[PDB]
Amino acid sequence: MYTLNWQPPYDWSWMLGFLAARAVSSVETVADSYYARSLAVGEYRGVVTAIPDIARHTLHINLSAGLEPVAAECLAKMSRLFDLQCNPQIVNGALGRLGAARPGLRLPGCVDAFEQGVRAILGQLVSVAMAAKLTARVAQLYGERLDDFPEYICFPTPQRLAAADPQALKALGMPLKRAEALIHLANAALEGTLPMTIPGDVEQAMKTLQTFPGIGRWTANYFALRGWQAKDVFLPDDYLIKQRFPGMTPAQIRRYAERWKPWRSYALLHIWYTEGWQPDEA
């Protein structure tokens, strides 16, 4: 129905693949040719379906009737999720060899900063697959089911999770601390204390984010990267990243990563997805 453009190349299989690994049952549905999920903009709700068109370098977006009133916001959330803004020539030109194997690579965003904030926290310690499980369990117990599309459920809203009983969330498979970290976030979301869009000083904002309980530096970075689509953040505390920089302390990795400014976020994605990558034999 609605259509947006993007600049080639765009590695849709890599992206869909990435979203598929982390998809949340009842919330999203990922296939090799499309992506679809529940979505709530204020009191408006429905199902969004994104269908890429390679030959045309266009993305077709359909919205169920309930979302039509806020169509444009839905589109903007979709464009942030898929990084339609990216100019591969600029980024690939800057990274050189690091991104030559997958020039279509994009930064997987999100459709809602609050949701991404919840996703990032439950992503702590556990595995990608396991986090998706847990999130799926939190969506289950706290999300609203779409009247018009029963199969789908909306990601839990801030007001709902802010009222949740720490004990209940704990019961789902997380320490009490983690559950408290979630409740605190929902409240910050309600008060306007959790930046919902990228802030002017990502560094300062991430720092402030770290005063939140349950949110350490890994969570704040990963959150800025996904929740804000911050393009210049590396994840030196990341598990897989420690594996890509054998025997290197976080500050070492951070300093090494500096050579990729101002597209560090993109370099991170490349390192993550380069099987045998290893620092330069220098």
Partner DNA sequence: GACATGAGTGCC
Partner DNA sequence: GGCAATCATGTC
What are the residues binding a second copy (CB under 8 A)? 4-5, 7, 42, 44, 68-73, 75-76, 78-80, 84-87, 157-159, 162, 189-193, 195-201, 204-205, 208
Cβ neighbors of 145 (< 8 A, separation 6 or more) are 152, 153, 154
Q: Which is nearer to DNA, 13 or 252 (CB)?
A: 252
Extract the tokens encoding 227: 């929740």
Report the residue number, 132 or 202, with the smaller CB distance to a second copy.
202
Site for DNA contains 214 (CB under 7 A): yes
Q: Say whether residue 216 binds DNA (CB under 7 A).
A: yes
- Binder of residue 140, out of a second copy, DNA, none (CB less than 5 to 8 A by kind): none
Residue 113 burial class via C-beta count within 10 angstroms: exposed 0-12, middle 13-18, buried 19 and up: buried
Residue among 201 and 275 whose Cβ is closer to a second copy: 201
Please say which residue, 167 or 211, places its beta carbon nearer to a second copy: 211
Which one of the listed residues 147, 148, 238, 280 is annotated catalytic? Answer: 238
Q: Which of DNA, a second copy, none does residue 239 bind (CB under 5 to 8 Å by kind)?
A: DNA
If residue 20 lies in a helix (H) or strand (E), which one and from where to where? helix 12-22
Q: Which does 218 bind (CB under 5 to 8 A by kind): DNA, a second copy, none?
A: DNA
- Comparing CA positions, the residue from 122, 157, 117, 121 lying closest to residue 136 is 122
Please choose which of DNA, a second copy, none residue 205 contacts, taking the beta carbon within 5 to 8 angstroms, the exact cut-off set by kind: a second copy
Q: What is the DSSP string of 140-164?
A: HHHPPBPSS-TT-BPPPPHHHHHHS
Choose from a second copy, DNA, none: what does 7 bind? Cβ within 5-8 Å by kind.
a second copy
Task: Say whether residue 9 binds DNA (CB under 7 A).
Answer: no
Is 201 catalytic? The answer is no
Length of the chain, in residues = 282
Q: By the 8 A CB rule, do 95 and 266 touch?
A: yes
Q: Looking at 20-28, 49-57, 58-66, 174-182, which segment touches DNA (CB under 7 A)? A: 174-182
Which residues inside 226-265 make contact with DNA, applying CB under 7 A? 237, 239, 249-252, 254
Is-contact 268 241, C-beta < 8 A? Answer: yes
| Near DNA in 86-145, by CB under 7 A | 123-125
Region of residue 91 (left: phi > 0; alpha: psi -120 to 50; beta: else): alpha
Q: Name residue 49's beta-bridge partners.
A: 36, 62
- Ramachandran quadrant class, 59 (left: phi over 0; alpha: psi -120 to 50; beta: rest): beta
Binding site for DNA (CB under 7 A): 123-125, 175-177, 181, 210, 212-220, 237, 239, 249-252, 254
Catalytic residues: 238
